[PDB]
Write a protein that binds this ligand. Structure first.
Ligand SMILES: O[C@@H]1[C@@H](O)[C@H](O[C@@H]2CO[C@@H](O[C@@H]3CO[C@@H](O[C@@H]4CO[C@@H](O)[C@H](O)[C@H]4O)[C@H](O)[C@H]3O)[C@H](O)[C@H]2O)OC[C@H]1O
Ligand SMILES: O[C@@H]1[C@@H](O)[C@H](O[C@@H]2CO[C@@H](O)[C@H](O)[C@H]2O)OC[C@H]1O
Ligand code: NA
Length: 183
C-alpha cells in the first residue's frame, strides 16, 4: 500500500512459508519442529524510524522463537530485534544488559552482544546485535521504532544507513505456527 517491497527468507524451507507482498500477509508453519535456524517475513529494502503496525496470530509455546521487528544497519554492521512475543528463550538472559526502554504501553528489556564470523547480510562477518524484549507480550499493535532506535543509539547503534526492515517470525528449535499482517 503502504508499502511492502522486500521479502525476508533465510532458510524458510525449514518449515512452510507463504507470503503476499501486495496483501501484506505472510504465514509460517513449523509444527513438525525445526532443526536449524530460520528467519522469515515481509517489509522494506531500506528501513527507517517510521512506526510499524502489525497484526499476528502467533503460537510458539515450547519453541526458541521470536515474533519481532527485524532488520540491519549497513555500517557499522548491526542486527536488531524488537521482540513483541517469544517462546521459551529470552535473549536478555545471557546477553549484556543495556537497561529498560518504555514504548507503546510496555517496558522492554534492552540487551546487546557481539557475534563473531556469523551469517550476516555481507556473507559472514563480525556485527553487534541489539535486542528489545517486551515485558508484557503482545501479538498485535503499533511499534514506535523511533523509540527503540533512539535508545540503542545511546549505546553505539548506528541509527542511520539502514538495510532491510521486516516484521519477522524466527525460530531455531522446537515447534510452532504463525500468521501475520502488516498494516
Ligand atoms: O491455509 C492454512 C493451511 O496452510 C494450514 O495447512 C497446513 C498446516 O500445517 C502445515 O505444515 C508444516 C509443513 O512443513 C513442516 O515443514 C517441512 C518440515 O520439514 C522440512 O524438512 C521441510 O523442508 C519443510 O517444508 C512444518 O513443520 C509444518 O508445520 C501445512 O503446510 C499446511 O498447508 O491449515 C489451515 C489453513 O488455514
Ligand atoms: O538476511 C539473512 C540474515 O537473517 C541471517 O542472519 C542470521 C539470522 O538468524 C539469526 O539467529 C542470526 O543471529 C543471524 O546471523 O544471515 C544471512 C542473511 O542472508
Ligand atoms: Na506499517
Amino acid at each position: 500500500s503502504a508499502g511492502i517491497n522486500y521479502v525476508q527468507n533465510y532458510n524458510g524451507n525449514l518449515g512452510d512459508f507463504t507470503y503476499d507482498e501486495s496483501a501484506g500477509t505472510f504465514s509460517m508453519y513449523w509444527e513438525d519442529g525445526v532443526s536449524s535456524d530460520f528467519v522469515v517475513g515481509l517489509g522494506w529494502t531500506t528501513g527507517s524510524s517510521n512506526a510499524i503496525t502489525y497484526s499476528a496470530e502467533y503460537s510458539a509455546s515450547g519453541s526458541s522463537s521470536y515474533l519481532a521487528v527485524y532488520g540491519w544497519v549497513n555500517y557499522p554492521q548491526a542486527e536488531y530485534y524488537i521482540v513483541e512475543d517469544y517462546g521459551d528463550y529470552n535473549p536478555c538472559s545471557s546477553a549484556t544488559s543495556l537497561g529498560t526502554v518504555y514504548s507503546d504501553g510496555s517496558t522492554y528489556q534492552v540487551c546487546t552482544d557481539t557475534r563473531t564470523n556469523e551469517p550476516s547480510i555481507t556473507g559472514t562477518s563480525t556485527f553487534t546485535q541489539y535486542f528489545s524484549v517486551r515485558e508484557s507480550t503482545r501479538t498485535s499493535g503499533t511499534v514506535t521504532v523511533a523509540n527503540h532506535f533512539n535508545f540503542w543509539a545511546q549505546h553505539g547503534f548506528g541509527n542511520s544507513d539502514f538495510n532491510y526492515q521486516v516484521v519477522a517470525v524466527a525460530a531455531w528449535s522446537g515447534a510452532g505456527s504463525a500468521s501475520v499482517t502488516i498494516s
